[model samples]
Target: MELWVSPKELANLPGLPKTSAGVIYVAKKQGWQNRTRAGVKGGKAIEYNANSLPVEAKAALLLRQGEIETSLGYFE
Candidate 1:
């Protein structure tokens, strides 16, 4: 699958979302370039934030249990 950063998203600037496709391939590194190998591994391999992700994207993450927002710590 093709991996790309939307120019529309870039052009929007300011508070625009930076949604990456879950089904699509994303580079291991950040910025706008794609690479075969990643500089890091899972958990640290990719960075995802709700504010950076699109609405549907955030929804899918929450649905799949990829994202969590709890104030209290279970072991604190």
Candidate 2:
């Protein structure tokens, strides 16, 4: 399965939405990219990669302090 950051996690970031659809809506509005994929257990999953985002989106999408940093830490 591919790594996928959820809307809940994104919500904890700077300016993302708490709801899945809201996250997708706002990200698209900012021209950020996202996609649907299969989860490990086999369901439709929303996914986003902070690294794929532009610099502005990257900064806002990175994890906050005290959060378990993901691979995105290298970019942060």
Candidate 3:
């Protein structure tokens, strides 16, 4: 239910790299809006705006969000 997500949170999602660092590279290259994470963690973690994700990533995320676990958007 978070509007923003860290690279780690999205590492397992489709259309993204399998590693947190790889996700960071994509986020930086995409110029995603980020802010300091506000958790109890010690490090200055950052999270990217989920809304800025690519179309493929967004589609997959939408499926996950709805618990559909599927999205094969296809033409008839």
Q: What is the lDDT of candidate 2?
A: 0.60
Candidate 3 RMSD to the correct structure: 7.4
Each model's TM-score? 0.29, 0.50, 0.68
In candidate 3, which residue ranges exceed 4 Å CA deviation? 66-76
* Clashes per candidate, residues 3 or more apart or on different chains: 0, 0, 0
For 1-76, candidate 1 gives per-residue lDDT tens digits of 3322333323322333344342223323333242333554533243334344556544544454423336544533
Which parts of model 2 have CA positions greater than 4 angstroms off?
1-4, 18-21, 54-57, 60-76
Error of 2 at 34 (Å): 2.5
Q: Which pairs of residues have clashing backbones in candidate 3? A: none
Residue pairs with colliding backbones in model 1 are none
Q: What stretches of model 1 exceed 4 Å from their correct place?
A: 1-44, 66-76
lDDT of each: 0.37, 0.60, 0.73
Task: Provide the lowest-lDDT 10-residue window in model 3.
Answer: 67-76
Top candidate (TM-score): 3
Deviation of model 1 at 2, angstroms: 29
